[PDB]
Amino acid sequence: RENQVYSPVTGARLVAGCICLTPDKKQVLMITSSAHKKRWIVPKGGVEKDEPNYETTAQRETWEEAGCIGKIVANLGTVEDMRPPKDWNKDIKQFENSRKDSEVAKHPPRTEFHFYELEIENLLDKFPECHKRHRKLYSYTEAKQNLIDAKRPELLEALNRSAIIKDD
Ligand SMILES: O=P(O)(O)O[C@H]1[C@@H](OP(=O)(O)O)[C@H](OP(=O)(O)O)[C@@H](OP(=O)(O)OP(=O)(O)O)[C@H](OP(=O)(O)O)[C@H]1OP(=O)(O)O
Secondary structure, eight states: OTTTTOOOTTTOOEEEEEEEEESSSSSSEEEEOOOTTTTOOOOOOOTTTTTTSHHHHHHHHHHHHHHHHEEEEEEEEEEEEEOOTTTSSSSSSOOOEEEOOOOEOOOOOEEEEEEEEEEEEEOOOOOOTTTTTOOOEEEEHHHHHHHHTOOHHHHHHHHHHSSSOOOO
16 A cells, blocks of 8 residues: 655655674575565565654564564665566567667666664564564575575675674
8 A cells, every 4th residue: 555655756666675694794684575475585564654763663574574573774775666668578678789789778766775784683473474484594695695596686796784694
């Protein structure tokens, strides 16, 4: 429903999420997509009109989607979902070409993500989406490949800004 908040500039939907790390920072918590049962992503969801800050949305979504509780130790800033609209590929105009580079035709972002780094304090076996998704820890290398397989580079960018140990 329209409790959703949008960028007043780009009309992008405003989303907050967490990069949930283990205390040793060797692993990150991932959840399976609802629409696509095999795509592994990280907890995130739409900011609602009542919510006073992005941290609120991020910790609410981390609980609802991944039954995870922890403390926010870092602001990982913003990343954007620059996937083109559903209109794309049945359009006449598709790409915009430079002399030494190629780009997708200029379009507004779908989503603006505000990500936080969380240190996991507890994982509970029961949470609101406990039967709708799976949830598992992955090393950096495993995590990175999951996000490419999920076709979500903006989520990998968020992961890369975290303190996750990448030497594994
Ligand atoms: O609201 P959210 O943040 O929880 O995200 C929902 C959904 O939002 P909605 O509330 O408007 O339905 C997204 O729709 P858009 O905002 O992109 O239009 C959808 O992205 P999509 O276009 O299908 O793209 P992909 O599935 O190919 O990535 C996303 O798929 P995932 O991120 O892969 O899981 C879903 O995640 P969730 O259901 O939690 O697993």
